[PDB]
């Protein structure tokens, strides 16, 4: 029986200003009892109503995830949120807590690229974004075009991996069509990160030329 | 407990022409008694002598691995190798099999990029490589300078993800130093793939400039 507690996405925190936290509970061998997920703050202030979802998996195990809406100001000013997990036939109560980092920070470096022509695909182009040397690993990536954010499904971002020096890197990939760049030849890759200043974002544009 | 069985890397398979497979056994509860890893083929032909290895991790976990060398021709022609795992404290043994993935083939497209100078850090640059539109997902990636292969610890390659089409993509990152590019400002990103004509390889060169 595992219990994980994740922090809000930077996008939800700093752009949409509606953060949430998710308490994920994985139970290898469940008795199908009533696992209770109670939320609480360190200050004693009340918590908003949380969503809950249970799902049986193919490998014979139940996952319970509860998502708790959190206040923007509250998180940014350093509130500690706790997920208490309880089950009748379980030795003790698992307790996971989360809060905004007070350890080392580093803004990300962003670099945007556009692939050259490849024989037999002159209408297609792949744009790629390197984002590196940032910490913590919490980061959100968006692609913009005509000053407008494209749907998330359009692009693909890799999992945060450690760099050799310090911090993390991720790559983001976005396929684009001739129509797009001929309409306007400028695509922005934007990273959202708490260590970034002054507004928690760092973005870079690239063109197909 | 959980067991994993990998396939041979394209490099070992096609370039060194001495492929091996590994049966990894992760034991979260190190109990007394020797764990058994027995090898076999689907055809029922003799397997070569394998290598057993044991080591305890920092998180109180035991890691036992057995590596079996396999034949080049044998693997390509579609042999299935098999690893039967037997722990002292378990009734039914765990079995894992591996074999050459079979589907349509596609050659990889390689693209290689160099970052511009980031404020402050002038004595180093990051090189990026995008390798996309290939299948199956198996692919080796290596960096070279002066026709000399750099150590694997120097670069970092992401796990193969699905593209919007029908192929897979992978990124690879390598930090270089001022002493290296001033000696010879050219770096090769080389990918080894089954469908990579003409000699199982595709590469592309890049410069810091
Ligand atoms: C039967 O099958 C189910 C799934 O079908 C298995 O359930 C999975 O269990 C694993 C671990 O037991 C879960 O993995 C954990 O995910 C956490 C959340 O992060 C993931 O999800 C977010 C967003 O969804 C992604 O952004 C992120 O990249 C991850 O993919 C991680 O936090 C967990 O730990 C990892 O991160 C921490 C740092 O916080 C590290 O310290 C850890 O080392 C580790 O890297 C972990 O990865 C997984 O989510 C479960 N899947 C589902 C669908 O719920 C059962 O375990 C399996 N049963 C058996 C017996 O095998
Ligand atoms: C205590 O700490 C140890 C490490 O010190 C942890 O051991 C690791 O456990 C995880 C989970 O089993 C292992 O991760 C698995 O890796 C497999 C592939 O191995 C890669 O890395 C090795 C390098 O040793 C390479 O040789 C290999 O080629 C790979 O690059 C994956 O196959 C496993 O599953 C993943 O892939 C499959 C696809 O087939 C997916 O289905 C899965 O979803 C998943 O993505 C898995 O990721 C890891 O290998 C172990 N490390 C070591 C050093 O042995 C213990 O787990 C940890 N204890 C606890 C309780 O967490």
UniProtKB/Swiss-Prot annotation, chains A, B:
Residues 1-102, 108-207 form the Ig-like domain. Disulfide bonds join 23-83, 129-189. Signal peptide: none annotated. Glycans are attached at residues 36, 48, 59. Constant region of immunoglobulin heavy chains. Immunoglobulins, also known as antibodies, are membrane-bound or secreted glycoproteins produced by B lymphocytes. In the recognition phase of humoral immunity, the membrane-bound immunoglobulins serve as receptors which, upon binding of a specific antigen, trigger the clonal expansion and differentiation of B lymphocytes into immunoglobulins-secreting plasma cells. Secreted immunoglobulins mediate the effector phase of humoral immunity, which results in the elimination of bound antigens. The basic structural unit of both sIgE and mIgE molecules consists of two identical heavy chains and two identical light chains; disulfide-linked. N-terminal variable regions of the heavy and light chains form the antigen binding sites, whereas the C-terminal constant regions of the heavy chains interact with immune receptors to mediate effector functions. This is Immunoglobulin heavy constant epsilon.
